[PDB]
Structures are given as structure tokens and as C-alpha cells.
């Protein structure tokens with residue numbers, strides 16, 4: 001790394017700095033005084049103080065990236081969000097007065113809930129001894145399950161069975177399916193939850 | 209509803225209607241604009257279930273010039289110019305909607321760049337073997353010209369005998385609609401049918417039967433270069449296309465009884481850098497010499513009132529779904545990121 | 561296979577021919593019988609028009625020069 | 641040593657590219673009417689009328705399609721010479737698929753129009769005779785990475801061995817691009833393959849509309865007639881590098897074309913290997929221009945599958961219409 005160990009990561013949150021001195025605890029006050037001394041790294045291209053910033057969508061865009069082509073990945077992401085918005089407006093305009101109160105049109109709410117519906121709770125970790133790798137059920141950490149939801153969505157949208165259907169349209173359809181607890185990604189979550197219940201023999205190894 | 213105006217008649221818009229949106233009826237949308245509107249504005253029309261256009265200074269000035277036009281003087285060329293995505297196409301659409309309500313005969317070319325690139329069926333004209341025909345591009349235009357001007361096709365009548373084939377001809381005094389039909393049924397005679405139509409409209413308007421509006425978007429295509437090729441892979445010049453050759457005659461101010469309104473466009477242009485928007489730069493020496501003398505009209509980014517009203521229109525359609533978009537800080541961020549450019553603002557608001 | 565290039569001179573130019581043709585037609589429509597192509601081209605509006613055109617053709621094209629051309633053309637074509 | 645991009649490679653089509661309207665757009669070009677007149681003189685019927693307007697069922701018959709394709713290919717070469725002389729001047733390679741090979745040699749100055757056309761006529765007639773001799777056919781198959789072709793051929797033979805027939809034939813007949821082959825032989829074998837596609841892992845399966853099993857041993861009776869037809873003919877040294885269909889390499893000496901042209905009749909077509917031989921090169925090296933002189937655009941698609949970078953500089957000579965009336 002070109003940065004020394006001294007350099008610390010920056011904090012881009014904009015409302016943190018405006019917190020009044022009165023609300024500061026002695027511990028938070030000490031941390032604020034300590035950051036005064038430290039060297040801080042330059043903020044990387046990416047996250048900003050903008051109010052439309054969304055870390056989850058940024059990570060999804062980075063996971064769709066191929067060959068460092070960030071312009072194309074962000075273009076695909078915004079096309080997907082626009083497509084979800086337009087499809088929900090289409091469904092809302094054709095819906096009855098009493099079905100309009102339950103149609104979500106915010107594409108960000110749909111994206112977040114769709115990814116949340118695809119997160120697994122349990123997974124399997126192989127462990128090595130005796131020459132035989134042993135598959136033990138494990139409760140997945142929050143980071144791991146958030147990553148797996150995104151990876152499953154992107155792999156599902158990269159399947160070659162979707163011939164000439166463009167990625168924004170495939171991804172919007174998959175997101176709207178997962179928003180309603182349907183589709184192949186929810187089934188992939190279920191098939192891991194069942195294949196972890198089929199192997200509860202080694203269910204109590206707590207030291208993966 | 210501070211961003212809307214109840215005056216939906218373009219014959220009565222003025223400086224007090226600046227920045228406000230007026231609604232174009234579905235019937236007007238189907239008749240006047242089968243082909244004119246930008247590809248990304250028809251998406252908004254389909255999603256909002258309504259077509260509302262803002263009133264701006266460019267269109268108001270161009271409407272003032274067209275209300276006080278003298279139909280005895282030679283036709284005056286008005287050229288809309290401005291940076292990319294500043295709204296000159298929708299200004300031209302506002303003017304076309306004004307003229308269509310006043311029973312002008314509309315000659316609307318929605319994008320002239322399509323006639324000089326990506327042509328698959330290119331023929332050699334039987335009328336003149338030194339020119340090339342574009343049947344798919346001429347028959348596509350004839351259908352929409354028929355749609356816009358259905359009423360006049362029976363009132364207007366040709367003044368010469370037109371011979372399509374040894375078997376088939378249009379005899380003097382037949383309604384112009386027949387000519388249009390001959391181009392829509394047999395595409396082989398589409399390009400010949402367009403020229404005849406032009407040759408008629410330019411002549412009869414001089415006689416005073418009707419007023420003619422020649423609306424051409426992306427007019428810089430006519431005096432530039434093409435990306436079409438022969439079978440020997442040699443370049444083709446724009447004047448060798450009959451469809452482009454016949455449309456240049458309309459830009460010359462050798463007829464009266466109408467106006468020629470046009471808009472430049474770098475989008476879709478060939479061999480022009482991205483930041484070229486000025487009249488000479490886009491037109492070329494030949495284009496400027498052809499259009500000279502003409503009245504240039506500048507289209508700029510939104511001023512604060514127009515920008516605020518555009519975001520209020522989007523908020524009224526519930527098109528800004530982010531929770532921070534309605535707030536003042538969200539408006540400042542949209543303003544900075546778009547810099548009040550209508551196209552950038554629309555694209556940013558699309559996915560919020 | 562020599563080639564020659566030079567600056568813009570308004571005289572014997574396409575802009576001169578076009579404006580002369582347009583003004584002859586405007587007079588004909590006005591019903592005036594005034595076809596002297598020196599009387600038509602010796603006004604003060606033609607001086608401003610040729611100044612604007614020569615500027616646009618020889619110097620850089622900016623929006624100020626485009627607006628000067630606009631105003632000269634408007635005065636010549638009786639647009640207000 | 642010219643940079644790749646100035647030189648040109650001419651590809652000649654073969655069986656299956658026939659289409660009604662063939663020849664229009666080539667007649668008014670120089671020297672084509674005389675070629676069709678010579679075709680009349682050699683054949684004994686008016687090829688011109690059949691190609692221009694025919695029922696398509698006479699044109700689909702083996703005795704007629706091959707001479708038509710040969711003549712149309714050479715007419716297209718004439719048209720290309722007229723439009724772009726430099727393309728013909730800077731020619732490095734030539735190749736034909738099944739009968740187009742006979743065209744390529746004629747283009748390369750190894751044979752003449754009359755002798756080549758007579759050879760093609762005898763070939764077509766003999767192949768048709770052998771086709772009536774025993775029922776046979778051709779089937780195009782596109783496979784997956786899990787597909788086994790020789791294996792599928794073995795059970796395709798096991799079925800009709802159980803039925804009972806002398807030395808049943810079912811072998812891969814055309815190598816045209818990766819995982820896409822054409823198998824040839826008895827109908828029952830190809831029928832078995834159609835209904836066991838799923839077991840054999842075939843994505844798509846399509847019977848070729850041909851009379852019989854070309855490029856297999858079933859066409860052994862047609863070898864001897866064509867063989868005789870080539871004895872009188874004196875083949876010269878090809879001027880350009882003409883590539884063979886038996887082993888997919890250049891014809892090196894004239895003393896071996898006689899036997900390779902007859903072995904092709906009962907040998908699988910090595911088209912993929914020919915494309916590799918003509919276009920394979922290091923990444924970043926430029927490719928030559930490619931012209932499909934003849935009807936259709938099939939070889940264009942096959943080249944697209946075989947080598948995309950070579951396909952980027954591909955163009956076809958249109959034989960159904962012309963932009964300018966010469």
C-alpha cells in the first residue's frame with residue numbers, strides 16, 4: 001500500500017460533523033479530538049456527501065462491473081431503476097382505486113426489499129480433516145448474506161438462457177419477481193435452506 | 209398547480225405563460241405528432257398519460273414572428289440553434305402545434321439525419337439515373353404526412369399529369385391524396401411521390417390556396433456528408449439522394465405563402481464533434497450559404513423559474529420518488545448535476 | 561494540381577446574390593418598381609449586413625456575432 | 641509482403657445455396673451472358689431461364705443446382721472484378737465448399753469453364769444416380785459441450801443393425817463450425833438421432849433438403865464416372881492458393897488435384913480446418929478482406945461462427961440485384 005499505516009479512512013457523512021457540541025458524549029468528544037491529530041486518506045472516487053448516495057446500489061454496480069467499465073455498469077443500473085419505475089407506473093395506472101394503495105412505485109424500496117427477500121440465513125462451510133472435507137451448517141454473517149443475495153441476482157441475470165434480452169430488462173423483471181417472493185433467486189435461497197436442514201447431523205460445530 | 213397553464217391554445221401563449229406547462233390533447237397528439245416528438249419525450253407521455261409542454265422564450269419569439277408574417281414576401285427561414293439537449297426540438301413542436309391548429313399545411317421532417325445514414329434498401333431512381341431512392345424512408349414519411357394532413361388531400365389537386373408506369377399515371381386535377389397513396393402502396397414510387405408532393409405544396413401555396421409550414425429538424429444533415437455507400441464502397445454525396453435533393457428546394461426562399469422553421473442538431477449528425485452547436489459550425493459553408501439570409505433563435509438551459517416549474521411538474525406527476533428529491537437540498541443537487549439542462553435533468557429525474 | 565484559398569469578400573458572393581434576390585422579391589411584393597441593384601445595395605442596412613456576414617466568415621463564430629447577424633437580417637427582412 | 645487488409649480471400653459456396661432469381665444483377669455486367677451461353681452449349685438446356693425464374697423444385701434437384709451454383713459463382717467473380725479490380729488483383733487464397741471447389745480452381749487458372757462445367761455435370765448426375773441407388777440423407781446438428789458425435793453415430797448404427805441392413809452408414813459428413821456438424825447416411829439413423837437428441841445432447845436438429853448422403857461411402861458408385869471425366873482434363877498449377885476440402889490445406893502440385901477431387905466425393909468436408917488454415921493468426925494481427933463470390937450468405941455465417949475477427953472484414957457479392965444499371 002502507498003498509504004502509511006498512520007493514515008486513517010475518511011468519514012464522508014455530512015450530518016456527523018454538524019452534531020452540536022452539547023450532544024457529544026465524553027467518549028465521542030474524545031474521538032473527535034483524536035481525529036484532529038490523525039492523518040486521513042483522500043476520499044476515493046465513488047461515495048460523496050450527496051443525499052441520493054446509496055451504498056447498496058453502489059456495491060451492486062461494482063459487482064456488475066466488467067473490466068473496470070464503471071460507466072457501463074452505472075448506465076445499466078440506472079436503466080434498471082428507470083425500467084422498474086416505468087413498470088410500476090404502468091401497473092398503478094391500470095389498477096383499481098383499492099389496488100393503488102398497495103402498489104410500490106419507488107424503485108429504491110423495491111430494490112432493497114427484493115434483495116432482502118433473497119438473503120439466506122444459513123449456509124454451509126467445508127472444514128478439513130481426515131482427508132474428507134466436511135460440510136457443516138453455519139449461520140451466515142450479515143455481510144455474507146448481503147453479498148450472496150447480490151451475487152445470486154447477478155448470476156441469475158447473466159444466465160445464457162436469456163437470449164438477446166438486455167440486462168436492464170432482465171434485471172428489472174427479476175427484481176420485481178423477488179419483490180413478491182417469487183422467481184429463481186428465492187428458490188435458490190430455499191434450496192440452500194433445505195440442503196442445510198438435510199445435514200443437521202453436524203449442526204452444532206460452533207468453530208468453523 | 210403553479211407549473212400548469214389552463215390556456216392550452218398555442219395561439220394565445222405570451223410572456224406571462226413562460227415556464228408553465230400546457231396540455232396537448234390525445235387527438236392533437238395522434239394527428240399533429242405521429243412522428244415529431246423526441247424518443248424520450250414519448251416515454252414521458254406514455255408514463256404520465258399526458259403530453260404537457262412548457263412554454264419558453266424561444267417558442268414565444270418564434271410564434272410572434274409567425275403571427276406577424278407577411279404571406280406576400282418570400283418565405284423567411286427561422287433556425288433554432290442551441291447546445292445539446294436544450295429543448296429546440298420541443299420548441300419546434302410547439303410551433304408546429306400552433307400552425308396545425310390554424311389550418312396551415314404542415315410539412316414536418318422529424319429528423320433529417322435518418323436520410324443520410326444506415327439505409328439498407330437504396331435504389332437507383334428511374335426518373336433520374338444519377339440519383340438514389342430510399343423507399344423505406346420515403347414511404348414511412350408519407351404515411352405520417354397523410355395522417356397529419358388528411359383534410360387537405362382532397363381539397364388540393366395536382367396541376368400536371370404524373371406518369372408512374374406505362375400502365376399507371378395520375379391525371380391532371382386528381383386529388384393530391386392519390387399521389388400519397390401511390391407512394392404508400394407501391395414503395396417503388398415512394399421517393400418519386402414525395403418530390404411531387406413537395407413540388408405541389410411549394411407551388412400551390414404561392415397561388416394562395418393554403419399556408420405551408422416547412423418544419424425540418426436536424427436541418428444540418430442536408431448540406432453535410434453521408435455514411436451511405438455504393439456497391440464499389442464509394443461514398444455517396446447528399447445531393448445524389450433524391451429525397452435530400454428535393455428537400456433542399458423547400459429551404460430556398462423562392463416561394464411565399466408560408467414559413468420555413470428548422471432546428472439544428474448535433475445528435476445523430478455525421479462527422480461533427482460533440483461540442484459543435486453554432487449555426488456555421490454545424491451547417492458548413494455550403495449550408496450557411498444556402499440558408500443565408502435567416503433568423504437564428506437561441507435555445508438555452510432552463511433559467512431558475514423554468515427549472516423550478518419543471519421539477520414541480522415532475523413532483524405533481526409523482527415522478528420523483530426519492531424521499532430527498534422534494535427537499536431544497538435535493539433541488540440544489542439536481543440543479544448542479546444537470547446545470548439546468550433540460551435533457552440532463554430529465555434523464556436524472558427518470559431514475560430517481 | 562494546384563489549389564487556391566483566400567479569405568471572404570462580400571462582393572460577387574453568394575450572400576450578396578441571395579440578399580439582392582430577396583430584396584428584389586420584397587420590392588415586387590410591395591408593388592414598388594425599384595430594381596437598381598446599386599440603390600438596393602447602398603443602404604445602411606446592407607452595410608451592417610455585409611459587416612456581420614464578413615465577420616462570421618473571417619473571424620471566429622460566437623453568439624455575439626450570431627446575434628449581430630440576426631439583427632442585421634431582421635432589419636433587412638422587416639421582421640420585428 | 642502486403643499488410644493483412646490489402647489482400648483478399650474469395651469464398652465459393654456449394655450445395656444448398658440455390659435460390660430463385662439467381663443471376664439477375666449479374667447479366668448486364670461484362671462477360672456474363674457469354675458464360676451462360678457456354679453453359680447452354682455444354683449442358684444441353686437453358687440454365688439461364690431456370691436460375692432466373694424456375695419452380696425452385698427443378699432448381700432443388702441435384703442435376704441442376706450444382707451447375708447453376710458454379711456458373712453463378714463465376715459470374716459473381718466477373719462482377720466483383722468489374723466493381724473492384726484491386727480486390728481481384730490482390731487475391732491470396734481461394735476455397736469452395738462442396739461443388740464451389742470446382743469454381744475456385746476455374747477462378748485460379750487451373751481449369752477452364754467448359755471442362756470444369758462438364759466435370760460438374762458428370763459429378764451431379766453420378767451423385768444423383770448413387771442417391772437413388774440406396775435411400776440416404778443428411779442432417780445438420782448443433783451440439784453442446786456434453787455432446788458426443790462419434791458415440792451418437794455408433795448407436796445410430798446399432799439401431800439399424802438391429803433392424804438389419806448391410807454395413808449401415810452414419811458418419812459425420814461436414815465439419816463447418818464448432819459443435820455444429822452435418823451427419824450423413826440412412827434415414828433411420830438420422831431419425832433415431834432426431835428422437836434421441838436429448839440423450840445425445842443436441843440443441844437443434846434439422847434435415848438438410850438434399851437428395852442423399854453426400855461425402856460418404858454411399859457415393860462410391862459416383863466416384864468412377866467423375867474419375868473418368870477428370871482424365872481428359874489437364875489441370876494446371878493454380879495461380880492463387882486454393883484450399884482442399886479433403887484435408888483442408890493448399891493444393892501444392894497439379895498432379896494431386898485429380899485424385900483429391902474424387903476423394904472429396906466420399907470424404908467429409910473439412911471446412912472448419914480450412915477456415916483455421918486461412919485465418920488463424922496471433923491476436924492483434926490484421927485480417928484480409930473476404931468476399932463470398934456466389935449466391936447466399938451461408939459461408940458468411942459459418943465464418944462468423946468460426947472466427948469473428950476475420951468476419952468483421954467480410955462482405956458478400958450480391959447476385960440478386962444491382963445498385964447501378966451498368
Ligand SMILES: Nc1ncnc2c1ncn2[C@@H]1O[C@H](COP(=O)(O)OP(=O)(O)OP(=O)(O)O)[C@@H](O)[C@H]1O
Pocket residue numbers: 246248249260261262263264290291292293294295296297298299472473474475550551554
Ligand atoms: N419546452 C419543453 N417542455 C418540456 N420539456 C422539455 C422542453 N424542452 C426540452 N424538454 C425536455 O428536454 C428533453 C430533451 O429536449 P429536446 O429533445 O427538445 O432537445 P434538443 O435541444 O432538441 O436536443 P438535441 O441536441 O439532442 O437535438 C425533452 O425530452 C424533454 O424531456
Ligand SMILES: Nc1nc2c(ncn2[C@@H]2O[C@H](COP(=O)(O)OP(=O)(O)O)[C@@H](O)[C@H]2O)c(=O)[nH]1
Pocket residue numbers: 335369370371372399400401402403404405407450454
Ligand atoms: N416517376 C415520376 N416522378 C416524377 C414525375 N414528376 C415529378 N416527379 C418526381 O417529383 C420530383 C419533382 O422535382 P422537380 O421539380 O421536377 O426537379 P427535376 O426533376 O430535377 O428537374 C422529381 O424529383 C421526381 O422524383 C413524373 O412525371 N414521373
Ligand SMILES: [Mg+2]
Pocket residue numbers: 246296297473
Ligand atoms: Mg432534437
